[PDB]
Amino acid sequence: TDTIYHAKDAVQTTKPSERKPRLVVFVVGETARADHVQFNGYGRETFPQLAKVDGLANFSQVTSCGTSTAYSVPCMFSYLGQDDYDVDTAKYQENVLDTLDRLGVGILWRDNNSDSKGVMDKLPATQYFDYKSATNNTICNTNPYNECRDVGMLVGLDDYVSANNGKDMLIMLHQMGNHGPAYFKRYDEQFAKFTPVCEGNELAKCEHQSLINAYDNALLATDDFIAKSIDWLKTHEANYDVAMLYVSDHGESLGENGVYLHGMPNAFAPKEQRAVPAFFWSNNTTFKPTASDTVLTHDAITPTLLKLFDVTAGKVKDRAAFIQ
Ligand SMILES: [Zn+2]
């Protein structure tokens, strides 16, 4: 087909009509720094809603595959691992979502950031939706920049769960998160906790604390979005076994040594551009997460996903996952 396969041997050991069906939300983040998370020692409570969630596992030692929203995302769903990962040929490799779609799991990708980078290309166009425009995202008139909001991705998922009744389901929500240099645009007035913030076009011209405040506000918005995801998943506890996974595609630099956005090559990228937060919540002791401070990378994503849907592929039975 011109596709290079890696998991043709993959097999789902237990099916939806052998046990309770499983519904999972994978929230793909952007620009979130692990060292700006309270659970990892940050001095501000940037995730106050997740702090009150029972069964929520935080991961403090996760490193990203790359430093950009073009390099890390295809690697997050790749089978190869960042060592063997090549970005020029990633679009053509079989990835975890291809494998899961083959095994009967409903894949759904809602994107409020840019695109899937190619992860959803081999899948029918009816499974990818653009939520950056008001065409699909119902929440775009809550701020004076008229930017569509991440929580708009939650509206109308009950109908997807209804149409796919009794199916294993995986839902990727691609966050706008903490992107771009205009951090002050990324959140609504409900989250303007820290002040002042930087409105400037040039980050170098900002006062450092203003930039920090804007970034932390956007982190508050993300915290709220993840929490609302978990609540939504709770509205389906009765019929499905539910779980939520959050990873950021990379970190961000905020003036450390005059460095200000992301994008630097891994060989020279500072520590802040690769340390990302990772969260995992499950209603059920069905899955038991690995230890908090286990040293992990994006290579843990693809095993995790497979483990969630009881899939066995030969390539990734030696891999560290987020669950045991
Ligand atoms: Zn990014």
Side-chain angles (χ1 to χ4, degrees):
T1 313
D2 102 270
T3 294
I4 301 177
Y5 289 74
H6 300 282
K8 276 193 294 178
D9 65 312
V11 161
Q12 191 172 22
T13 57
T14 71
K15 306 287 285 188
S17 196
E18 289 179 89
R19 39 141 182 82
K20 194 156 154 177
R22 303 180 179 178
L23 165 62
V24 173
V25 175
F26 183 12
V27 172
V28 188
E30 179 86 351
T31 310
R33 289 175 56 158
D35 64 332
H36 277 252
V37 189
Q38 38 168 130
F39 311 130
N40 303 328
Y42 191 52
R44 287 171 155 179
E45 184 163 47
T46 40
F47 288 78
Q49 303 199 47
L50 302 193
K52 264 74 203 186
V53 175
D54 194 306
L56 189 275
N58 161 87
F59 298 98
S60 61
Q61 289 284 323
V62 179
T63 280
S64 65
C65 189
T67 69
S68 76
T69 326
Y71 188 97
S72 303
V73 173
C75 176
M76 289 167 81
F77 301 87
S78 177
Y79 273 102
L80 306 169
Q82 16 120 247
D83 259 82
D84 275 78
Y85 170 79
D86 188 270
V87 58
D88 315 307
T89 62
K91 158 181 161 64
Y92 303 100
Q93 318 288 322
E94 173 193 14
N95 63 62
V96 61
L97 299 189
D98 292 298
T99 317
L100 291 179
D101 177 271
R102 188 168 69 249
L103 300 181
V105 186
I107 310 296
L108 175 59
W109 191 290
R110 286 188 180 182
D111 203 295
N112 190 26
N113 174 293
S114 40
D115 59 286
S116 73
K117 310 277 154 182
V119 184
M120 293 285 298
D121 276 3
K122 306 190 215 64
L123 290 181
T126 66
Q127 306 186 26
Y128 177 88
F129 292 89
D130 187 335
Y131 268 68
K132 295 166 295 173
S133 76
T135 301
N136 296 313
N137 195 317
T138 65
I139 305 169
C140 312
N141 300 278
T142 68
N143 57 89
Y145 321 104
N146 301 101
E147 177 191 322
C148 299
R149 289 315 184 188
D150 296 301
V151 294
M153 289 184 283
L154 303 174
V155 165
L157 297 167
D158 288 357
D159 305 327
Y160 180 76
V161 178
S162 309
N164 309 267
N165 189 69
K167 232 123 81 186
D168 281 340
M169 272 170 287
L170 181 49
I171 301 166
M172 275 57 60
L173 301 181
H174 199 176
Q175 261 192 131
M176 179 63 77
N178 278 242
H179 205 263
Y183 304 106
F184 65 96
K185 294 182 171 185
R186 300 293 92 87
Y187 57 93
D188 282 353
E189 214 158 303
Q190 9 171 351
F191 304 106
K193 181 177 167 61
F194 307 117
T195 53
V197 305
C198 193
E199 282 222 41
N201 298 357
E202 28 233 322
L203 303 196
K205 191 55 61 187
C206 308
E207 214 99 79
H208 183 253
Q209 187 60 58
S210 302
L211 194 56
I212 299 297
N213 297 347
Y215 189 92
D216 296 330
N217 293 321
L219 287 187
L220 288 170
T222 292
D223 153 81
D224 169 272
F225 172 63
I226 295 177
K228 290 177 177 171
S229 289
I230 291 174
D231 282 356
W232 182 85
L233 286 173
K234 286 202 225 126
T235 72
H236 295 270
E237 270 182 351
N239 288 291
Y240 301 83
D241 282 315
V242 295
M244 183 273 172
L245 172 70
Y246 174 83
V247 187
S248 184
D249 68 336
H250 50 78
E252 189 82 328
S253 289
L254 306 169
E256 302 85 348
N257 212 332
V259 187
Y260 289 112
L261 277 352
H262 38 279
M264 299 198 59
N266 296 26
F268 310 117
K271 185 55 173 294
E272 308 98 40
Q273 294 193 15
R274 300 188 69 174
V276 298
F279 308 121
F280 172 81
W281 172 84
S282 186
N283 72 311
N284 221 61
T285 326
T286 306
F287 318 100
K288 299 182 176 184
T290 52
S292 170
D293 44 315
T294 302
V295 190
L296 303 165
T297 65
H298 275 175
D299 306 335
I301 296 173
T302 292
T304 305
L305 294 181
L306 293 181
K307 279 195 166 230
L308 288 170
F309 297 100
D310 256 32
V311 172
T312 40
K315 175 124 192 175
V316 294
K317 290 312 141 189
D318 284 7
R319 295 273 196 92
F322 287 105
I323 55 179
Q324 296 187 265

